[PDB]
Structure formats: structure tokens, C-alpha cells
Amino acid sequence: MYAVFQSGGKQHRVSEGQTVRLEKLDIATGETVEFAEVLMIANGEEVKIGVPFVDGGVIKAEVVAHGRGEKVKIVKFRRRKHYRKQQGHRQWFTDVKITGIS
Amino acid sequence: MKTFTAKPETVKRDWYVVDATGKTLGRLATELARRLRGKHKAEYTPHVDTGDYIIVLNADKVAVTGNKRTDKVYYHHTGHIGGIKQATFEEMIARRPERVIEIAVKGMLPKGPLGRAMFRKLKVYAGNEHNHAAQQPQVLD
Amino acid sequence: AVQQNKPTRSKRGMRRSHDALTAVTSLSVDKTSGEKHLRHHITADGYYRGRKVIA
């Protein structure tokens, strides 16, 4: 059932049904996305690739949310040299629910 | 998305036997330390003792190249005022033939609670008989 | 003489682990009167082993 695909410059081993958090997409809150960047499809027989990507495999998904992650604090500090620095960071994400491993 | 880690309770550990008759000490000791650590297993987690129980029998017959039978020295301090003891590879086998493999493996294991935990796995023996027939320990090479 | 740097709550406690004093848990009973007292000691009223030996 599970299939592998590349999205936000990284790959996800994903099953049909489950939600996946991935890097922000230029897509509306409740639209839909088709990944034709599918790397692998597993089942009884495994459809692996001797080229980049499969052939006619397309992962269809639905966008769930468009949130921001947990606030990471960044602390730079040079011991004894009168230098420190503070900086927060909340990374943007897009949760997607998978609805079709072809 | 949180990659797999071996959970101790779920770890199914296996039993093995290795005849060390005519084996090179270090090249044996390495392959032992690789197994005891559990590197060969595809569910290897560095913070968990995933490795297998090994029974090394005929430890006294272990081979060493060159002049290391006489020349290789095993130093140790007694923790005393000037108490540095030494013992050559012959002298070591004459007295305590188990220590030879023990020491060679222990050096190649990691240093800490888990490193000591994965040494407990190793079972060395001078003779050919072992009393762990109860585990059905399979033959390894 | 003199500490290099101050010990903790933890060590102070660790040291005090033996300071906990033990109870008696071994009170006697006088045969006649039935008054509690320490073993081999007289009672408050003035008994020992079921016989008055004190005014």
C-alpha cells in the first residue's frame, strides 16, 4: 500500500489515508495536490525505479492545514567577547492527507 | 517523521557459538564485537543493546601472528604505590585463557553502561564443552 | 580548614541519613499492675517484676 515521494526538497514514505506534515506549498487551505514525483510504490509486487520517478504513478492528496511549528529559540553567544544574540523561529508547514496511491 | 528505534522489550536476542581454534585474536574479536553490539542487525539502535549472545569456546587455542605469542604484553596497575604488573601472551594463556578474548573484545566495545551490558552477552570458555545447551545456541563462523 | 565551595542540600541530607534516631518498640508490662515501662527499669509508680520495692 505504501509509496515514497519527494516534495519539500525531501522524501516521505507515506501510506494511503494518513496525514503528513511537509514543507509549505503555494496552495489553498482546502484544495488538492497531485505529486507526480513518486519514487516508489510497494504492495504485493514492488514498483521500484530504474529511472528518476516511476512512469504513471501519481499521489493525490488533500491539504488539511497551513500552520506554524513550535517556536525554536536561537541563541548565539561568544564567551568573554561581549556578544550575544537572540532570535525566534516558527517554521511554516502544510499538513496533507493522502487520498490515492495509483 | 520519528524514525524507528529498537524497544528493549521487543528485542528478540539470539544465541550463537564460535569455535576460536586457530582464529586470529583480533579478527575474531572484531567480528565478536560487531555482533555483541548488534551492528549486523537492520534494527540497530546505538542506545539499545540489540546484539546477540555469543559463546566463544576453545579460547586457549586462539592464534596470533608474528612473535606476539611471547612479545605481546598485557600491563595493568594494581592501584598501588608502585604496583605495575605485566604478563605476556603465553603467560596469560597459561594462567587465564578467558582473559585474552575478554580483553580483546572489551577494548573494541564502547565504554559505558551499555558497553558493559553488551560485554555480559559474551561467554568465553577454555574448553570445548559449554553448559548453555538449554538455549540451542547455533553455530557461527 | 575551610570548604573550597559550599556543599548542597543533597550532601547535607546524605550526611543526615544516619542521624535519624530509633524508637523503643519494646515496652514491658508489669505482672501485677499492668503498667508499661522500659525493660529492666522500674515503673513510674514504683514496681518491678510484679512486686513493690520502693516507697
Next chain:
Amino acid sequence: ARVKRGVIARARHKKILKQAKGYYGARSRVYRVAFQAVIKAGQYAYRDRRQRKRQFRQLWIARINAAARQNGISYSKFINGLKKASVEIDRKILADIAVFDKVAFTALVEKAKAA
């Protein structure tokens, strides 16, 4: 206009002592000690976002190297085998496949054996 600074300072110290929650001894109790712990924690946190990406790669590579040698190929030859077959699958997933679906994994080692 005199400015008492008891309300603001308290709010500054209390903020840091909240980050130091959990630390041993003075490091959780005492601003002057906690403030160091909280900066150091920041420094280690900053460095460990870099080391997390390293550690996990080693972890995956070990898993892949383990799972490959069960099928009779070393890591070094396997990855070249996959690169030469233009397979784009990463360590993170090869390591995921290695643990979960070995019957699948075997096909990648065969796919690598071709090259």
C-alpha cells in the same frame, strides 16, 4: 521622575527561571546561576540542530549497511549501484524500508546488483 524597578526586574528574572525549570540545584533556583544554564542550553540547542542532521544520517547509513550485508552487498557498493541505476531514494527511507519491509528492500539490492 524616579523609577522603581522591582516589578520589571522580577518579571525578567522569573522569565529565565521558568526556562531553567528542571535543572539541578541552584541552576533552577538561583537567577545568577540559572541565567548561565539557560544561555548554555541555547548554545547547545543551536549546535544540536546541526548535529541532529549528522547523527540521524549515521544512524540510517548504519541501518542500510546492516540490511544490505544480510543480502550480500556492502553499503559502499549498494549506493553506487543505486546511483548508477538513477535511483533517487534517500538514506532516511532506505533505512525505514530496511527495518519495515525487507522483502521490498531486497528488490533495491537486486536493482543495485544489475549495475
Next chain:
Amino acid sequence: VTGSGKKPWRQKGTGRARSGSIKSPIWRSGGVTFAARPQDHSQKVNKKMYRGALKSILSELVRQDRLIVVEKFSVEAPKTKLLAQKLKDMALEDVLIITGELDENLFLAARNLHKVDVRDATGIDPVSLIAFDKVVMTADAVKQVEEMLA
């Protein structure tokens, strides 16, 4: 500060921080480093800037319609009750009643009224003209202010 110039303890020898005075501002109950002196915060304003500002603000009252120009504005007798009652018809509350001929009757009758203020045409101010929600100028007062600002 009151107190002696004497060193509380000597320079060296005692394992203590060198002090020179009880009155030092790092010590308690003595000092304040940069103690304030009574000072004059009045700052110069150029005649032309003051006039220019009045000309600026007084012209914005015409755009905003706060400026209610009128003919003769005067109470009958020195009574607040009448002044308060006549502002109901005029539909005013918070006001600056500028007058050329300053009537004592009108003055006295707006002293107790908080939101009303009765300045003379000569004594208009920058802050006052802005502060009050409406400004009632007498035709004579407009004529005096016109000549004053010029």
C-alpha cells in the same frame, strides 16, 4: 548629604571593599550621583513660528468647523445658570469663548463651568485653541486676532 568625610575603615588590611565616604552614591542612605538641580524647562519659540503655528491651527478650525464665529456674545447678569442655559440652544458644551471686550459678567459666569473657558482675544493660546472642542469668536475678536496675527 549630611555626614562626615571620614573613611569608615582604612584603605587596606580589612578584607572589605575600599570605601572613602558614607555619602557615596553606591552606599545606602547617601548620594544620588547626578542629583537634579531646580531648572527652567522654558524653551524659545520664534515670533514667526508662534504666529505661523497660530495661523496654521486657527485656519484648520475653519476646515473642521470647530470655529463658530458670532456677533455680540454676552450674558445678561453674572450668573452661570443663564450661560449654561444659553449654550443648550447654541448646542455647545466644551468651548473656548474668545471675546474682544472682556465682560466681567460673562467672565464670572464661566469660572465655575469646567468645559467652558473665556479668554480675551489678546490672550489666545496654541494649546487652548486645539484643546477645546469648539471655539466661539466674537466679530470684534476675529477683527482683533486678524490684526494681531496679521
Next chain:
Amino acid sequence: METIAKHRHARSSAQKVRLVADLIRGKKVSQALDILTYTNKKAAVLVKKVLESAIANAEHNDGADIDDLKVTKIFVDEGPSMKRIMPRAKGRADRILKRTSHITVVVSD
């Protein structure tokens, strides 16, 4: 019922009194009252009087019954210390803290 009694400003440090209080904790009142008779300490007399208070306290005001009563919570908090000057050799002065303790006992069932 819980029924508190407590000696406030008890002239003895916490650390000393607290040593006795650790004997009696979750023990039956009749058993606890015995111990402090044969505990050779000043603090035992001081802690007893509070317990012996707490029992009468409990039986008169609220709960009644002496047989079913346990010392559920006993604790000793440090009270106000009184500062006093101890003169030492070579002209120097120390400060002896005459310490006090707040002893509380709770006698529930």
C-alpha cells in the same frame, strides 16, 4: 475530621525537633504517646505536649474517640530566629541565632 494543634515559637531548632517528629508519623495516637515518654530528648516533651493537646483538641471540639486516631501529618517548620552577640577573642563579635520552631500535629482517622 483532621483536628490540628500546634506549638508556635517553640524554643528549639527545627533540625532537632524534626528528629523526634520522624518517629511518630502515621502511628496510632496511643502508640505515639508512649514513644515520647521514653524518647530521651527535650523535643519529645515539646512534641508530646502538642500531640496530647491535639487529642483533647480532637475529642472535645469535633471528632471524639481516642482509639481510632492516627498522627496523619506531623511537621516542624523553622520559626523566627533571635539574633544575639557572642563576643570572641581579639575583639571580634559573632551572632548566635537562638532559633525557634513551629511544630504542628494533625490527628485524623
Next chain:
RNA sequence: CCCGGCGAGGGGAGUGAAAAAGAACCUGAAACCGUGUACGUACAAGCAGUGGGAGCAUGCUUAGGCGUGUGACUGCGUACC
């Protein structure tokens, strides 16, 4: 009223809107010292954290898990001025 030495101190009862407003009396922080609950902790070496992470305990929506507390084991890591 009650315990105590017709003490200190307390528990009641009462007054008050309130008495952890009861005279050591508005608020009542922090250091510091305790009592009780959860987890860890008696073969393990070091700035005591930090990335990883099992278990256990709780809160939740449950027929997935996600918070919270703890943190066994493990990579890195010699305070501030």
C-alpha cells in the same frame, strides 16, 4: 469552654464583609527550610546540559494517538565576568 504549668501556645465559640484582617495584625515576591502525591535513583566517573530515547504516571479526545511530569540508555559538550 477545651489541652497546658490558675504559663507560652493552640482548638473551638463569637465579632466582622473577610480573622491564613487576631495585634509577631493590608498586599505578602525571592532566597532559604519543610509535609504529602507521580516518576527516576544503591556496577557507576567529570560545567550536570543539550540532540536522541525506552519505560512509568497522569489529561484528553478514544476504538490513531496527541499533551504533561519524570528520564533508564546513548552522540556531543571544560561555567560566567
Next chain:
RNA sequence: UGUAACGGGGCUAAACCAUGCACCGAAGCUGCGGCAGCGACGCUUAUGCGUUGUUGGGUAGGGGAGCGUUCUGUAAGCCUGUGAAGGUGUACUGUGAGGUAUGCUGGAGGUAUCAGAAGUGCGAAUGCUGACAUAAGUAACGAUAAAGCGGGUGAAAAGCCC
């Protein structure tokens, strides 16, 4: 002081010389997000961008733009016993100084916005005052002239009275 002159185990190849493809390997380079500085720029419009390059380690130090505090004006306004400030928790939120809402405590003050003025921000100064730790229930209890027992009084007696 202890092997102590491969970092260790250990190695006759796991050393060296030569060549050959592999792979690992950094915050380097690429991938996908996000922010900001300067230069262009289509010419939008006095700006942000279809955009587009490029940069963004930093002590002394120079230049920019802000947060917060007490006070004055806006304010005899607005929020507040249907619970202010303060204290103490929790949950959101901003790139940061921070901000917002609310539980408990508290029991009466608080103050938007945009301006104005500063006793305007503390971890260090063998800083100054108060409080509280540590060593520690440790040393010590002040002349080695000496106590003992019976009775009294008392809640209690080695010490008080006889």
C-alpha cells in the same frame, strides 16, 4: 606516581610503495520553505513589488530601527467591588526587547492613542542595606578548688532551699 613514543583494542595486512573505481565525511555546495540589508529595476508610483541580482561570522568601534519602565498633556474622557494595581499559574502570539487573554490570590485603584520629560532597564564593582544559607547540629560552654546523699518546694530539681 602507571602500560604511557599508533588515541585504544588489536593487525603480517588493519603496514608501506604504485595504480584503479567505490563510499563516508563540514554550518562547504545543491534541494524546498521563511526573514532581512543594499543595487538595479518594469517602471510601478513617492512605495511595495511582476520582480530581479547580491549579500547577511564578528571584539574595539561607527551608522540605522525599535521594546519596556515612572511621570505630564490628550483624561472631570475610558476600564474598574458584576473585582484595579500588585502577587501567582496556564494558553495563545511577534524576528527580539515583549505583548494579549484568562484561573486563583488580592481588595482599590488603573489608564488607550499620539505627543512630551526622564532618578529609564544590573550578575559581577574584595559594590551598599536587609533577609537567609554553608561549614554543623560540628567547635565550644571561660581556670583540674570536688563533690555526695537524704528531705522540701515545684508541672519539672545535678544546679534552688534546709
